[PDB]
Design a protein around this ligand. Structure first.
Ligand SMILES: OC[C@H]1O[C@@H](O[C@H]2[C@H](O)[C@H](O)[C@H](O[C@H]3[C@H](O)[C@H](O)[C@H](O[C@H]4[C@H](O)[C@H](O)[C@H](O[C@H]5[C@H](O)[C@H](O)[C@H](O)O[C@@H]5CO)O[C@@H]4CO)O[C@@H]3CO)O[C@@H]2CO)[C@@H](O)[C@@H](O)[C@@H]1O
Ligand SMILES: [Ca+2]
Length: 145
């Protein structure tokens, strides 16, 4: 843990640097874990957003995040680093944190990138749950160790 690769990782600059795929995202105080703002992804449909992050090859990273649903979900909220390999079929690979908690929860995983990327890595915040539960996420981490 030295440098955070994620731009606008605490949503303190609103939605700056975050793609909004289903127009279901807002940066609002009610969703804050730290600072003034957090990301709210509205319940009722599957929705999310993300950021393209070029990574170094052959390198070990920690992916981490804080999340909570404001109500018991049926599915999960997922934070993912995803990219294609450069191989026989360009395998798609996903390093996935799953959340279903209604208290602020920090989760983290470790992964090591391939020698060659088949595509540019993407950090996705994917609230696949389809209940009425709203999802809060804040303080996302992607750091080389
Ligand atoms: O909308 C216009 C906009 O689209 C953009 O492209 C988006 C696209 O719209 C989707 O939102 C898409 O969403 C995908 C996520 O990126 C991610 O790939 C996600 O991956 C899932 C996976 O499908 C599967 O569900 C998996 O389930 C796991 C689970 O997490 C757990 O591990 C369990 O134990 O195992 C199961 C497997 O059984 O988990 C992953 C959860 O992250 O799926 C979504 C696909 O529906 O992302 C696209 C961007 O990458 C852009 O094209 C944009 O330009 C355009 O304007
Ligand atoms: Ca914040």
């Amino acid at each position: 843990h030295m440098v955070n690769m994620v731009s606008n990782p605490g949503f303190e600059d609103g939605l700056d640097s975050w793609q909004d795929w289903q127009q279901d995202m807002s940066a609002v105080p009610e969703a804050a874990h730290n600072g003034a703002l957090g990301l709210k992804i509205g319940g009722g449909k599957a929705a999310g957003g993300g950021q393209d992050i070029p990574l170094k090859p052959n390198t070990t990273y920690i992916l981490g995040a804080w999340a909570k649903f404001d109500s018991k979900p049926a599915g999960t909220f997922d934070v993912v680093v995803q990219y294609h390999l450069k191989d026989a079929n360009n395998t798609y690979v996903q390093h996935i944190l799953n959340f279903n908690e209604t208290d602020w929860t920090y989760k983290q995983l470790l992964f090591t990138t391939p020698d060659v990327f088949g595509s540019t890595p993407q950090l996705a915040l994917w609230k696949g749950d389809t209940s009425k539960a709203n999802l809060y996420v804040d303080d996302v981490y992607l750091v080389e160790v």
